[PDB]
Design a protein around this nucleic acid. Sequence first.
RNA 1: GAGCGUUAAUCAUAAUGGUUUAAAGGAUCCGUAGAAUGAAUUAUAUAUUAUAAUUUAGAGUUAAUAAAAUUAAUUAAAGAAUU
RNA 2: GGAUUAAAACUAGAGUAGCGAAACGGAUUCGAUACCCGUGUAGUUCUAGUAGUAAACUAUGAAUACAAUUAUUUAUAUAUAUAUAUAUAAAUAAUAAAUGAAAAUGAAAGUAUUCCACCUGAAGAGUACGUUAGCAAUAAUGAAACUCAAAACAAUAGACGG
RNA 3: AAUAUGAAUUAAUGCGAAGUUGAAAUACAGUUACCGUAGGGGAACCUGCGGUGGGCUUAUAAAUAUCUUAAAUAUUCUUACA
Lengths: 66, 49, 467, 237, 53, 154, 102, 64, 123
Amino acid sequence: STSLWRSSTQSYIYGEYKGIHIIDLNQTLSYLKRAAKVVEGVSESGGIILFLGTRQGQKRGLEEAA
Amino acid sequence: AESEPFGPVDAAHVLELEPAVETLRNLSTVGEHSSGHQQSTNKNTKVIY
Amino acid sequence: TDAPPVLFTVQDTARVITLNRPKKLNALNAEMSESMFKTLNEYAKSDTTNLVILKSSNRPRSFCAGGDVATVAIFNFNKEFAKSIKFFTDEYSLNFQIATYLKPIVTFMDGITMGGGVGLSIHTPFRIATENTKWAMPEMDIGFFPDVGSTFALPRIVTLANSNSQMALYLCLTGEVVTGADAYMLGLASHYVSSENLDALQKRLGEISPPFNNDPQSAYFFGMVNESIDEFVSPLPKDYVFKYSNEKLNVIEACFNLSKNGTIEDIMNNLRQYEGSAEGKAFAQEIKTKLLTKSPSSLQIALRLVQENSRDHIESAIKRDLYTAANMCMNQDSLVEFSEATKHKLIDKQRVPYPWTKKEQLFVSQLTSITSPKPSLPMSLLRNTSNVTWTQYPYHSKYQLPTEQEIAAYIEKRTNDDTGAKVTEREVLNHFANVIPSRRGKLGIQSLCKIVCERKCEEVNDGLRWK
Amino acid sequence: MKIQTNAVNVLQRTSAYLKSGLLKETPAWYNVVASIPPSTKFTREPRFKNPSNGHIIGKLVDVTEQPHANNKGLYKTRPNSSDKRVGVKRLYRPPKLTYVEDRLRSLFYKQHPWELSRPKILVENEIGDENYDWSHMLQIGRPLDGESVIQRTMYLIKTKQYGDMVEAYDHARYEFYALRMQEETEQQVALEEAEMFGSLFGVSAIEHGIQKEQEVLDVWEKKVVEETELMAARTSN
Amino acid sequence: MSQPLLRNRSPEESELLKLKRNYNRSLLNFQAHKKKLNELLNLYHVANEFIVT
Amino acid sequence: SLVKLANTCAHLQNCSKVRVALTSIPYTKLQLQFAYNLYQQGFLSSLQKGSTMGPDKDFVEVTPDNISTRRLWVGLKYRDNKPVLSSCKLISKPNSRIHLPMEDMKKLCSGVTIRNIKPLQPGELILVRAHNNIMDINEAISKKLDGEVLCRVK
Amino acid sequence: KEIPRYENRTIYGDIDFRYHGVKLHLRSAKPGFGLRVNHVIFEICECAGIKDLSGKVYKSRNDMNIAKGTIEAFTKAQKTLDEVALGRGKKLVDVRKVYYSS
Amino acid sequence: NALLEAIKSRVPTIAIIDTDSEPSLVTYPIPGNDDSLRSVNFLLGVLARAGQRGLQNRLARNNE
Amino acid sequence: ATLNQIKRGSGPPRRKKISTAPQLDQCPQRKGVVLRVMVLKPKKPNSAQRKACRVRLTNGNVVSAYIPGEGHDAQEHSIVYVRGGRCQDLPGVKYHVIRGAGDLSGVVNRISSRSKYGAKKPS
RNA sequence: GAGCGUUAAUCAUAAUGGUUUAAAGGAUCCGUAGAAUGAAUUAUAUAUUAUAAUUUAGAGUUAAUAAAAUUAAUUAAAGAAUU
RNA sequence: GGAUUAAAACUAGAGUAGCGAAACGGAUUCGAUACCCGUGUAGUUCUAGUAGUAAACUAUGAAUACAAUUAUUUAUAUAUAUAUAUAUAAAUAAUAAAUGAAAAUGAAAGUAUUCCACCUGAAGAGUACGUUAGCAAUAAUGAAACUCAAAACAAUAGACGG
RNA sequence: AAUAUGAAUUAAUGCGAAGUUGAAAUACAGUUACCGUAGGGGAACCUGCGGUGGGCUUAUAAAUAUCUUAAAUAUUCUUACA
Ligand SMILES: [K+]
Ligand SMILES: [K+]
Ligand SMILES: [K+]
Ligand SMILES: [K+]
Ligand SMILES: [K+]
Ligand SMILES: [K+]
Ligand SMILES: [K+]
Ligand SMILES: [Mg+2]
Ligand SMILES: [Mg+2]
Ligand SMILES: [Mg+2]
Ligand SMILES: [Mg+2]
Ligand SMILES: [Mg+2]
Ligand SMILES: [Mg+2]
Ligand SMILES: [Mg+2]
Ligand SMILES: [Mg+2]
Ligand SMILES: [Mg+2]
Ligand SMILES: [Mg+2]
Ligand SMILES: [Mg+2]
Ligand SMILES: [Mg+2]
Ligand SMILES: [Mg+2]
Ligand SMILES: [Mg+2]
Ligand SMILES: [Mg+2]
Ligand SMILES: [Mg+2]
Ligand SMILES: [Mg+2]
Ligand SMILES: [Mg+2]
Ligand SMILES: [Mg+2]
Ligand SMILES: [Mg+2]
Ligand SMILES: [Mg+2]
Ligand SMILES: [Mg+2]
Ligand SMILES: [Mg+2]
Ligand SMILES: [Mg+2]
């Protein structure tokens, strides 16, 4: 909701629609690719990768990712 | 400027001093048996005996 | 008081060079070339500049519609040959500086990139294309030759049907325009990035810096630049289909396969005696029509240069282009029609092709003279901060789509391994998409590998053979 | 919250540990992070265009661009108070995305309230696979609903077959009525034809409602009786 | 940087500006004058209901 | 106006703290010269003329008709999670103006506190106004000019 | 933590840092100048490897808050010449060092 | 808590950053909806497969 | 304060020690005559019989001077020399008499710090 | 150290200050002096100032349109209750 | 410098129900010059003046430029598929940053600029003396000596609370 | 007339010990404290009038909730299907 906006995210926002802020997916894709390359690098280097998520329903995804 | 050359001679001008290499050369001509030893510019004071 | 022809700006540790001649489609004159050549030497000495970005302020209309040859034509008509030779010494010297530049240069080919524009991008390992890219070398219609080191680049970077410079000769002799994704798949563009994403990419390029005690000239930093661009690449359009079908790729590979002493007539014979599919036969007639509306002298000169600058080092290939350009503006033997054709098309707007008069077949000696330095006219390329030469680009291969010769090498090696295993198309795709570090996940890499295996390899049992 | 520095500089703090010797062994992530630098600017960025309607943000119309008189009959000869206030904030406020289709959608469901009762699935399948030719209303892959009408209306106005949006909207509405009538008949007839060949059904929709109402009306009977007995005793007081 | 910071109005531009500004002031005066007369007319129509004798 | 310049110096500090990429300042000759020096010295990414609503995309001649609505738009730079332009303060203040001869400017650039002005620090820019032109103190010393020490930027 | 040091002997320029009630004014010094500062700052400089420094503490002289303020000042109030050069796209030359160079 | 411990321990972190979340607290933010299991599992799946490819490339170089 | 208020006088107060022996008139010591020898009680938490003396200085000022050392031979009309220095626990005694000067003899049998008690060096 | 101590004195030792709550905002506003401070462009001069011309962003004047019925002073009334 | 300035107080003339310093009584109490009760004078009211003092407080002088959000009202304007929607200001509330001894402040107690008032340990003391003003009570101005190494604020943990 | 000195005479105040008469203040301090002002009283203090919070923001519910294929179908799924 735009009422809950943390203005430090301003540069990621594409706009507001139906009372919520729309995230810019063009930036999400670029950030996602960079983050993915980091995971691949650490995995290929033998590092320990921990997946943390404590919202209900996330366990199945978290367990398979690990 | 990022690509401007600045060397010892330029630094010497900024600090208003003779180049450091010149100082070394002038310090090597101080020995009594060294080359360049010269002292005559002061022989210009009238003296009477 | 007037807007500078080229604008230079700082982007954090990146230095942005922007072509600023919108009314001329960013055409390159001696002033622009000289300014860029001088400013790049300074950036090479600087220790605060990590990379350079060559873009246009007119995107998506054009990046560079080509060198300003219309002005060079007026010089020839006025016998201002010194002015003309200055225009080519500046441009070719800038193309040589970009080719040998030790810091990453990233060209945004967001628009028409024809002629001089190709020289601004073809020599950089990071030449980014967009949906608006329109790569072409339309010199045969103006009576000139393929300049800006395109006779050294195209025969070494094209990906498909370029084993013997067949595709390179097709683009240089026909002046075909390639658009966006097709330029990326052919090897004309190292990367394919949507125009909308160029602003974000530029900002990221300015923010990245060599880590620890590595200079921006190290191979490590070049890898970083490649990865940064890849984060902004997006998947190709779903409907997109490569421009040239295997049958059309078979016509080019056969009809433009000459020997070390081939001639344009040999190509005309193949295009006139081609046999195969109906599409291939019809395609060969289209090429024959086009190649018969070009300058008979330019086609022969282009073939000569391609057969000469495809096995020589960069400096000798760029120098040979300066000699040819000077030996054409000053038409001592009335063997070319560069000046008259240039006025017919550019200075004067005429859709019809210039009626050609020099329709003879120049001898090997005549071609040698036109492409060799005259002992009376001393011309030399301006000195750059690198002053190095080499026969192979030091970075182009790592960061573009693989060529048909690199895929063949892996099939032959794998097929001749002690493992005694079978080479399978699936194994080929995996080896190029998920193995090589610099090519991991490269856009349209599996599609290209399948085009090569379907046209070059023979599938017997569970193995692949290089027909 | 303050812009944090220590999360994005892990590589630089780690390099100080390694150079000094406080950390003997390079971490596995160290090389990976060095090759992929984090973004550390965290700046607010201006915007000069609304992506939805293409409206330009940050443009001031000068008095020289308003030579003719206004709706009041007066010429503009000087900047007004609004023109003299700095508007930098508009460059940074996320633009409100608007669409003409939103106006038609509100109209359609105001004219056809019961179309709301047809359940809609908001879970997407794959937006990128939609290959629709809006020359016709029906499409393979999507239901016939209010959105079918809106997209048909946009195609008509885009192809310039109709000029006014109202005329294109009415044309699309009738195409929608025809398709809705053919489906209402296919279902009625299919039920009738099945019963004529010996199809049997346990519970009809009407029967389902009666059973549910009975369950509620039974609990209501008990409570009414209980609360009509507490009142009688409490009132006796 | 070379561009002049301000360009003074040409004498012609000042003439057209004065015409528009005089027109703006004159139109507002006229519109207020006509509004007052229209209120005086609507008061005449009802003065037959008012008592002065 | 030195008051206007003080307002601009404080404004740039405020913008740096929140890390806005683009901001506007009053459109005057002094402001333009001040901003241009910062741009050439690498403190500002961009410098564009514009209006109250934003930078102009195409040239818009400035006249008395629109002078009241003109603004200068400057782009701030941030690298490695730090603002490049962290502080901006006046030396010569409206209520106490400081004029120094070239000899005293050389002492200020040499580590000597002159008239309570702390000496020039590494990587700091001190601007001087001479005959209504703004230049770096080192440039004024090169031209043998005496002038008012206006401000220091770091 | 690592603290930037100019020539591994002093700080980059001068520092005016406020840590709670402590006003710290630290000035860089010439080689061979020594440590001429509050005794608390002296010990920190010794451990950190700062050899030349001048400074004065105003307002609160609470030892605890001087020590923490000093550490914070050495990290948050300093900028290396390299960091300034890269941020501004300019070359910064140490004139004294160039004067004694080849 | 976990993010602050990661900072203290110099552990690089990746996180999904929604419009109400502080970006600077993580090394590599991913702007995106963190409330939907579909959006989270889509982003997690992409990161997980990227890790898988890295693991497969490490096990492959050991074989050859 | 503003710049103009400083021009009008506003400024930091000056720090300079103030005189604690005003009756001496900025002299190292002054001669006097003992008016009456007295014994005073220290202020708490101290307990003792502190020997003091009222003295009329040659400038007419009458002061109370502490007699240091163990045992004294000071009487009324004895000529004494008074120096600065207060007796902390005795309020109002702001001066000291000098042992070994005038009619006040040095401390009898003093061995240490003799110069402070007018005791000559034993042979 | 042929001085040492002590007393009397001078300099230094924090304003690279403060005033909601610790010393410290004047009851309030109006306004004189201010050797206090203060817009824009251009041209001169002997130059951060002066002068001239020009400008409208501060500060004002008038009107139009809409809105509001408060605050002062004065006069004329009402109300419940109390004794 | 000028003007205005609660309550009490004073000058003159009216008014005086109720309330109510004082005074006189009744209670309470060991005592009760009090708290509670009675009778109740000045005063509280009006007119014409004097006086210029309050915890006269937001314990926070005025002006200007500027800086990240949300919520809620108000105002103006805009639009329409007419009742909402979109804008721009103001007010208030909660905050980011920043500031701060902290409590907290939050568009200032932030970032800056300009002008005024004021402060420089406690106590002595807002006293003494003088002066000015006032019918008067008083108001303004405003010290020094002596003495001491104290004195004060925010916050912390306790103890205690009819 | 001023300055200085002494001065009959007379005013204010500090510290020291040290009792006495009450219990005014700090908790709801047992009558909320304090500010201005007036009257009264052995003494602190008491009383009237207005003001302030540096005392009461210490602020915390009159409760009640709903229908579509429960599974041969969702729940399984490991780069597969398409
Ligand atoms: K304070
Ligand atoms: K009465
Ligand atoms: K109050
Ligand atoms: K004031
Ligand atoms: K009391
Ligand atoms: K009182
Ligand atoms: K009272
Ligand atoms: Mg969320
Ligand atoms: Mg002793
Ligand atoms: Mg001696
Ligand atoms: Mg001092
Ligand atoms: Mg203040
Ligand atoms: Mg006040
Ligand atoms: Mg006060
Ligand atoms: Mg106005
Ligand atoms: Mg009376
Ligand atoms: Mg009574
Ligand atoms: Mg009065
Ligand atoms: Mg009083
Ligand atoms: Mg007062
Ligand atoms: Mg009040
Ligand atoms: Mg005012
Ligand atoms: Mg008084
Ligand atoms: Mg307290
Ligand atoms: Mg009592
Ligand atoms: Mg009590
Ligand atoms: Mg009490
Ligand atoms: Mg009484
Ligand atoms: Mg009271
Ligand atoms: Mg209390
Ligand atoms: Mg309270």
